[PDB]
């Protein structure tokens, strides 16, 4: 395996396999997505980190959702939010209480169906030892049968330059197909201590409110529907399917474009904002869309490609303050995640997030950002160290893992493929607006919008589904491994790199 200490590697493109169709969504008859509890018993149980290893969130839903007809939102105050926890399964002597809420998905158009959720609960457990296994039960102890089985998770290790989570899984754009189950099975077999999910979770917005789905909403329904519809039960199916993972392994989610889910009154992000726990208060972002947290000696920043990222905005000011608080002798690694890649070389979404790069890249570079993880593009790509489109030994490694297995088409065409360079005005993200993607003025592609071969800042690209694992070893070395779904033999690795940071050179 190469090391970033060797400098940039000559670009590699893996030849395409013959297309075998789109991934197939799990049906609503799959036992893993059906309601397996009754009454107010907890379902969709999920653990999330707090800003520091000494606290964590436990979340769950009680009660079935309502889809269609005259939905009647539940009163969240009718079911309590209690977690009992402890260091042994038979001694759950600690107790925490939390908050409950519901959300709805409402469309004021004739023929469209409305949805309202079960009661969602979020409870923060305080006073946890780092690096330690906690057993817990959640629910409402005053309702017979309304407590979960005993589950367990391990807190992140203590913050320090020699203290790291063993394995961090990174995925994006999962959806809920049979290929998603392959990604999640591969990931779970690698026993990660933490899962990062870089947006585009359930793909509920590939469905009409009446349950009909498509591989491409724009292709199918963009002209024949009054709004970009969703089928919200796909979120519940996803949460139920994922429970064996999320109830035992902390999972940190950040939003992608498929979470927009616009509804009545121009309300957006309702499901995303309600369903997951985020360390928004603890990291002082006060937003579900971006936040930070420490996991051992790693300071993680989750940024919002779909909230104002301009230099004059709230997110940028929060980011400046967050970075200024980082002590690189305590957390040597600075790692970021967000939905939209800045250096993807696929035709799909080429240069789409350029305005976010122009806004934020220099700030992150000035603080020595080590690694960036993104999703969005349905393929795998790893960059050489790069800053402002220039190979740079102090630039971040950008890795894109939006290849989680959702039913939309794989990204296969490259912008540098003959005749495939998109027209510049077609590239910017419409939801966020702006145009920042000008033709290059230096380097091999000077005067053009694209290269005519794989750009030298792209180390490796492959159109396969999969997931990655980050193994930070010490304050200067981390091992990254990406695994393709179609390889199932023990120890298979699709791409790997030793990432070596040089603080005396770059900070
Ligand atoms: C930091 O971690 C790296 C990777 O585990 C260590 O590098 C290894 O050190 C051993 C002993 O010298 C070698 O056999 C391996 O070949 C090294 N791997 C690589 C990629 O270089 C490194 O020693 C550690 N640095 C510390 C603990 O200060
Ligand atoms: C769905 O909710 C909206 C907003 O309350 C309402 O206008 C609409 O009539 C509802 N549709 C149905 C079928 O109840
Ligand atoms: C998705 O899963 C199906 C069925 O297991 C498989 O045939 C197909 O090759 C997978 N798609 C990719 C891109 O791996
Ligand atoms: C849902 O509505 C669309 C048209 O809006 C229709 O083509 C589709 O067949 C419907 N699906 C069901 C299950 O009714
Ligand atoms: C509608 O919602 C989105 C997301 O908040 C926002 O960007 C947009 O400006 C809003 N449009 C109007 C007319 O308010
Ligand atoms: C990035 O490169 C362009 C073109 O060379 C330059 O004008 C711009 O100032 C650079 N941005 C930063 C933050 O250096
Ligand atoms: C930018 O490059 C494209 C080809 O990639 C070319 O068609 C276009 O005319 C160029 N625009 C400018 C202002 O140079
Ligand atoms: Fe996306």
Residue numbers in the entry: 2 to 508
Paper quotes:
Crystals grown using glycoengineered recombinant protein diffracted only to low resolution, so the protein was enzymatically partially deglycosylated and repurified before crystallization. The resulting crystals grew in space group H3 and diffracted to 1.42 Å resolution. The refined crystal structure contains a monomer comprising residues Pro2-Leu508 of the 510-residue protein in the asymmetric unit. Four disulfide bonds and seven N-glycosylation sites are present, all according to previous predictions (Dionisio et al., 2011, 2012). A preference for Fe2+ in the MII site of the MPE domain has been described for TaPAPhy_b2 (Dionisio et al., 2011), a feature arising perhaps as a route to cellular redox regulation, and correspondingly two iron ions were modeled in the electron density present at the active site. Anomalous scattering peaks calculated using a dataset collected at the iron K-edge (Fe-SAD) supported this interpretation. X-ray fluorescence spectra combined with absorption edge scans confirmed the absence of manganese. The iron in the MI site is tetrahedrally coordinated by residues Asp174, Tyr204, His379, and Asp201, the latter of which bridges the two metal ions. The iron in the MII site is octahedrally coordinated by Asn258, His340, His377, and the bridging residue Asp201. A phosphate ion is bound to the two metal ions and the side chains of His259, His350, and Glu409.
